[PDB]
Design a binder for this molecule. Structure first.
Ligand SMILES: *[C@@H]1O[C@H](CO)[C@@H](O)[C@H](O)[C@H]1NC(C)=O
Ligand code: NA
Lengths: 35, 65, 259
């Protein structure tokens, strides 16, 4: 293990996704994908 | 790096003509009053970096010595 | 970050500040990709025009930081560096082809509410997410404006800034500048009279451009803040290292026996 821990749980924020809470502006990002 | 405006003649790696970097084998002749700037072939000095200068609170001495 | 907002606490837990030891100052942004590895731009470490060539003794990284200047004791981790790795084909002539570097932390860190790795994209991720008009997100402690009246101090933020910016079409990127753009770069930002603004600026470079996947709810670093002609100028765009295109080199370095 030269990479270390963190790959399996990457990209998931403890204060957001882990708590099923959205940050104040992520909605904007998704709107950009949709319309 | 952000290329910003050349601030004296002879500089390169800065914005010389409009919003265009004046690159390595070139140098920037600064227009004064009513003159355009010109990026010309020649040896230039990179515009010095602006120090990202602050008032940092001191961290433990252990992270230096 | 020009035209951004104060980031919420814990918004970008992969955010890393690269710091010079003596004088103490912010050098660049960087990102955390594991308990042990930090990604940044090559030019943050090696840049001959500024006589810049850092060794591991010159630098610290700071993680889980929200404030720019405070020392946040119960919250931030300061780490030394074991090794610097600069992409071997990094071409600091012609604006920074392959502007990518890996820093190996002297010690593995604990994760926390404020410290957590970002995902690196794979093929599917790149194919799904990299489309003109799709918005990503840039974060950093750099200048809030390209220029100032009195002092740089006046454009410096108290807290980490964030801005959301759209990927721009390659032809539009190429048309916006006379610098040769390679496949190792992409540009992002609003077109004039899109009626929104924003950009990376001085002190943000080496920092991450991330996108959230709708498919798995995970954040991915598609970019590294690499270069710009000014900040937030009309008809100009931020340029970013294409992380996915350089992933093979990332894998090589990390999978190597030694580290
Ligand atoms: C960069 O770093 C090493 C010293 O750490 C040195 O041997 C090398 O020549 C330096 N200069 C450049 C321009 O790479
Ligand atoms: Na712009």
């Amino acid at each position: 293990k030269t990479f270390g821990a963190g790959e399996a749980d990457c990209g998931l924020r403890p204060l957001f996704e882990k708590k099923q809470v959205q940050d104040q502006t992520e909605k904007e990002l998704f709107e950009s994908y949709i319309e | 790096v952000v290329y910003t405006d050349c601030t004296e003649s002879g500089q390169n790696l800065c914005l010389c003509e409009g919003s265009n970097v004046x690159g390595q084998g070139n140098k920037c002749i600064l227009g004064s009053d009513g003159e355009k700037n010109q990026x010309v072939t020649g040896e230039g000095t990179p515009k010095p970096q602006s120090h990202n200068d602050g008032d940092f609170e001191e961290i433990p001495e252990e992270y230096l010595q | 970050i020009v035209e951004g907002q104060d980031a919420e606490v814990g918004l970008s837990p992969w955010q890393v500040m690269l710091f010079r030891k003596s004088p103490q100052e912010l050098l660049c942004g960087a990102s955390l990709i594991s308990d042990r590895w930090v990604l940044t731009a090559a030019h943050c470490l090696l840049y001959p025009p500024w006589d810049k060539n850092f060794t591991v003794d010159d630098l610290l990284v700071r993680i889980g930081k929200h404030s720019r200047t405070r020392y946040e004791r119960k919250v931030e981790k300061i780490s030394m560096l074991d090794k610097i790795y600069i992409h071997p084909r990094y071409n600091w002539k012609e604006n920074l082809d392959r502007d990518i570097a890996l820093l190996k932390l002297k010690r593995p860190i604990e994760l926390s509410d404020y410290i957590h790795p970002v995902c690196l994209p794979d093929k599917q991720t790149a194919a799904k997410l990299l489309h003109a008009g799709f918005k990503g997100r840039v974060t950093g402690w750099g200048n809030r404006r390209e220029t100032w009246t009195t002092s740089v101090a006046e454009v410096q933020p108290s807290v980490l800034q964030v801005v959301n910016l759209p990927l721009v079409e390659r032809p539009v990127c190429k048309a916006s500048t006379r610098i040769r753009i390679t496949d190792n770069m992409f540009c992002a930002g609003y077109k004039p009279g899109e009626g929104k603004r924003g950009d990376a600026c001085e002190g943000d470079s080496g920092g991450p451009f991330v996108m959230k996947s709708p498919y798995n709810n995970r954040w991915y670093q598609m970019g590294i803040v690499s270069w710009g002609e000014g900040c937030d100028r009309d008809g100009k765009y931020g340029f970013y290292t294409h992380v996915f295109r350089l992933k093979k080199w990332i894998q090589k370095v990390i999978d190597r026996l030694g580290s």
